[PDB]
Design a protein around this nucleic acid. Structure first.
Lengths: 452, 309, 58, 55
RNA sequence: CGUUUAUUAAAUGCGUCGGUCUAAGUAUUAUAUUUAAGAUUAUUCUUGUAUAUAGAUUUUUAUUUUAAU
């Protein structure tokens, strides 16, 4: 038999119904007090599944016609808008499954544009691409038929005025205060109102030194060639002072009194530095020179090497009988190089703070920045092209496949450098939210104590 | 600081509530928190400025105008604080039109978004952390289980996890009442009506804010009454007798017996409760006359809810 | 008096309710319904069975 | 809400990179800041993994 | 201190107050009204509308409406 006591199946699940009858819900029963978690907690998202589109690339051209039309063309753009995140999408397109993102070709085009997109960013170009196909720095002064005479918009012939006015100044011998070298990622670093370029004829840039630049001046500087030599000195960034800082251990965050063993190894560094020739004990938490700090990381993670040289009862012996892992400090500095400048728009800007000494990235003029990127892509190529561990390391995304190829022990190392960097951030964040003084009482007393 | 709320009193009558600590207007309009919209005035479907049809709770008060000013300060409010992650009161912003105070909380995993500001809160302090007690610290957002009888809580959420709806107005507070029900806690809403709130509901501990609103806020300036702009509220007894039954009369006619807005609003008649929730225990009518304290004495169970309404 | 949906305004009739023609009649009705369920129905449809099965065999 | 970088990296290297050996792009790492969204991001890139049922 | 077709103790307007509203908006709030701010005070008493009400009418005045010869 099949028992049934009645008043059982309602014919509609008991949620969508009153005792009997489905109930009505019309966005007026609902409050706006739900949906107010949106101010912090973001709404649901549809993460697209990553595709190596080779299934869509049944044949050749459609695969090498989106290399440009979709991959390269996203670099010409990023080599124009923000050349610092030009290593971010190189990860974005290789996490998505693409093949030759860090190939010896994509970089040597990314660095090509990054180098030149500067000299047509100072020329006044606002969009790097004219149409789907060609670049706007190749619109010739005919319809398309002129040889090299660039179609100079009014913005340009006012960007080429500011350049010419900067030339005449240092041609007068004065200091060439080029306007767009106070121009950074936030606009004028000087906190001034941005001077917008199609400048009104009733707001002409006036320098009380008597420098004349007008339309009669810049009209002959039409084609690409006679500016790359005339304003060579300004459109070109300088790569000398940044030449090798990415190929060198620098940990802008990490302090001398900060190590994974917070005391044990630094007790050795104080022990070596009292029984020393030129001995100096450590109370000043002031940062030690960069290269000696990365030694302890190469001497604090592996309890192998923590004791392997802790036995050493002299100063330089520990400081210099470990050059064998100092031959390993680049293979880790190639890791702290990628994963630093990779993931978020913030990790990269915080990264350049350490290496190229940008106190604040947001105020360093573009001339100083495009260089550091140019000096950073110039050493991405070194890593990808010169040494064999560079390719796979680039195409590695997780740690599991990262540990395999390059030094398994070398990955033990910096994952206690990164874990030490981030734990310094732990000091700042949780540093704010640990002072508890609230109560019903002391929150009253904290008024009068605030009164004086 | 003297008295974190002041009746600032620019003109001897014009008393607006300045609070020392109030953030200057510059640090108010925040981009991803600022909503703007035209408010429909009192116009509802077919323009036609009109209230609501008798039975409904969607307000288009006939006498409403300039509800969203367009360049007035309008930041959105959280109403859903998170349970026990520490806060950090960064500033205390005071919008006149939305009389509420509201201060920006960092909330300790970056969320520079939280507003409702309980009374006696100071800026630049951490709040959501409990002291030795259960969660008895002013500003700490407490589930209704964690409160004990007789202590005020504000921004109580009506349905658990559906955002704080009760006791949001300045200086207001829902008092717990120590009920006998198994998994429910009755709160004496300020309307003197008690309601069987689910104990898992979240409330923010303390009073609400900005005491000295109940009185002591009096504009009496033609420019300053643009904190509350509304349409003129004409006499109902000078309304073109063809139009409104109270009208004409060659002088001051007192008014008709049964007052009526357009349909009826007789003085205590029109009571417009039409659906009572399962949680409601005693409406404001069942308590309107007793007192504030006597309602705080009893224990409230399901047998206290009157089977007839 | 939830039985009949009556709020009492005047005392001295809340007392005289329990025997009022409204209450005592609502008492009888809500009782005889119980009678039907308590004894009647489980016996009514008992006899309705014991005669049919009588028929289909006798 | 896993917002502050210090907290996201403290979860993303452990759960979506460590436990699952998944790797999220930059633009998705933006909205990948909640327990609700962490669950979905996995539950798409693991659903796009089951070999399509072979008839 | 505004605002009006025969232009004003017209009608606005702040406060107080009365009533309504805790499943669309915050019951020191917003609807719906009566007054008018400021300063003194705001008296006596009820036959009807309203509320509450108990098959309805008929009865019936905590507060409100209107009333006080």
């Amino acid at each position: 038999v099949i028992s049934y006591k009645a008043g059982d199946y309602h014919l509609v699940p008991k949620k969508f119904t009153v005792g009997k009858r489905i109930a009505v819900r019309s966005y007026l029963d609902r409050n706006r007090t739900e949906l107010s978690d949106r101010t912090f907690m973001p709404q649901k998202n549809w993460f697209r599944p990553y595709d190596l589109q080779d299934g869509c690339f049944d044949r050749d051209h459609e695969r090498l016609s989106y290399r440009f039309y979709n991959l390269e063309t996203k670099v010409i753009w990023k080599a124009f808008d923000t050349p610092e995140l030009i290593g971010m999408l190189l990860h974005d397109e290789t996490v998505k499954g693409n093949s030759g993102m860090y190939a010896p070709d994509m970089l040597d085009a990314a660095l090509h544009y990054t180098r030149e997109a500067r000299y047509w960013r100072c020329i006044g170009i606002t969009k790097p691409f004219y149409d789907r196909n060609t670049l706007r720095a190749h619109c010739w002064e005919d319809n398309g038929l002129q040889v090299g005479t660039l179609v100079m918009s009014q913005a340009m012939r006012h960007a080429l005025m500011d350049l010419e006015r900067a030339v005449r100044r240092k041609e007068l011998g004065l200091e060439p205060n080029y306007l767009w070298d106070r121009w950074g990622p936030i606009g004028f670093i000087d906190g001034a109102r941005a001077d917008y370029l199609p400048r009104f004829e009733h707001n002409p840039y006036v320098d009380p030194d008597g420098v004349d630049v007008t339309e009669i001046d810049v009209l002959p500087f039409n084609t690409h060639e006679q500016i790359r030599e005339r304003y060579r000195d300004f459109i070109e960034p300088d790569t000398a002072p940044f030449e090798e800082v990415f190929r060198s251990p620098s940990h802008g965050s990490l302090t001398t009194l900060a190590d994974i063993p917070n005391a044990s190894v630094v007790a050795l560094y104080k022990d070596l530095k009292l029984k020393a020739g030129t001995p100096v004990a450590g109370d000043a938490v002031e940062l030690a020179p960069a290269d000696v700090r990365t030694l302890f990381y190469l001497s604090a993670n592996p309890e192998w090497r923590a004791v392997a040289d802790g036995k050493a009862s002299w100063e330089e012996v520990v400081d210099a009988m470990q050059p064998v892992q100092a031959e390993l400090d680049e293979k880790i500095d190639a890791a702290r190089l990628l994963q630093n400048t990779r993931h978020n728009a913030e990790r990269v800007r915080a990264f350049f703070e350490e290496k190229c000494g940008f106190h604040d990235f947001m105020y360093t003029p573009d001339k100083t920045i495009t260089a550091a990127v140019l000096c950073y892509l110039t050493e991405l190529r070194r890593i990808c092209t010169e040494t064999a561990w560079g390719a796979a390391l680039a195409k590695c995304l997780t740690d599991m496949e990262r540990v395999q190829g390059m030094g398994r022990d070398a990955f033990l190392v910096y994952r206690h450098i990164e874990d030490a960097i981030l734990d310094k951030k732990r000091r700042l964040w949780a540093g704010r939210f640990a002072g508890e003084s609230h109560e019903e009482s002391t929150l009253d007393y904290l008024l009068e104590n605030f009164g004086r | 600081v003297r008295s974190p709320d002041h009746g600032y009193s620019q003109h001897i009558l014009q008393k607006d509530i300045w609070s020392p600590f109030q953030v200057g207007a510059n640090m108010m309009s925040y981009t991803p928190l600022y909503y703007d919209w035209k408010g429909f005035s009192s116009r509802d479907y077919f323009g036609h400025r009109s209230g609501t049809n008798p039975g409904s709770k969607v307000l288009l008060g006939h006498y409403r105008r300039d509800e969203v000013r367009s360049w007035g300060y309008r930041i959105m409010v959280n109403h859903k604080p998170q349970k026990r992650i520490p806060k950090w009161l960064a500033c205390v912003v005071h919008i006149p039109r939305k009389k509420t105070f509201l201060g920006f909380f960092l909330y300790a995993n970056g969320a520079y978004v939280a507003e409702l500001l309980t009374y006696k809160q100071l800026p630049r302090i951490i709040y959501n952390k409990a002291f030795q007690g259960c969660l008895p610290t002013i500003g700490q957002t407490v589930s209704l289980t964690e409160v004990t009888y007789g202590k005020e809580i504000h921004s109580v959420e009506m349905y658990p996890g559906h955002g704080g709806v009760i006791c949001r107005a300045s200086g207001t507070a829902a008092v717990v009442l120590r009920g006998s029900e198994p998994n429910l806690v009755p709160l004496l809403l300020p309307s003197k009506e008690v309601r069987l709130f689910d104990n898992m509901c979240h409330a923010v501990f303390g009073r609400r804010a900005g005491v000295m609103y109940n009185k002591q806020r009096n504009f009496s300036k033609r420019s300053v009454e643009e904190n509350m702009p509304h349409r003129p509220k004409v006499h109902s007894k000078t309304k073109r007798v063809s139009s409104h039954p109270a009208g004409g009369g060659n002088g001051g006619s007192p008014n008709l017996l049964t007052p009526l807005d357009w349909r009826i609003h007789p003085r205590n008649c029109v009571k417009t409760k039409y659906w009572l929730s399962g949680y409601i225990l005693r409406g404001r009518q069942y308590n309107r006359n007793q007192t504030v304290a006597d309602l705080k004495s009893k224990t409230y169970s399901w047998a206290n809810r009157d089977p007839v309404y | 008096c939830a039985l009949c949906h009556i709020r009492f305004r005047y005392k001295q009739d809340y007392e005289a309710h329990k025997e009022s023609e409204l209450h005592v009649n609502r008492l009888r009705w809500v009782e005889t319904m119980n009678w039907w369920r308590e004894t009647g129905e489980p016996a009514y449809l008992k006899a309705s069975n014991e005669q049919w099965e009588w028929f289909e065999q006798h | 809400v896993f917002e502050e970088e210090t907290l996201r990296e403290r979860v993303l290297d452990r759960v979506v990179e460590g436990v699952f050996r998944l790797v999220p792009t930059s633009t998705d790492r933006l909205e990948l800041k909640s327990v609700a969204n962490i669950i979905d991001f996995v539950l798409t890139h693991v659903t796009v993994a089951r070999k399509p049922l072979q008839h």
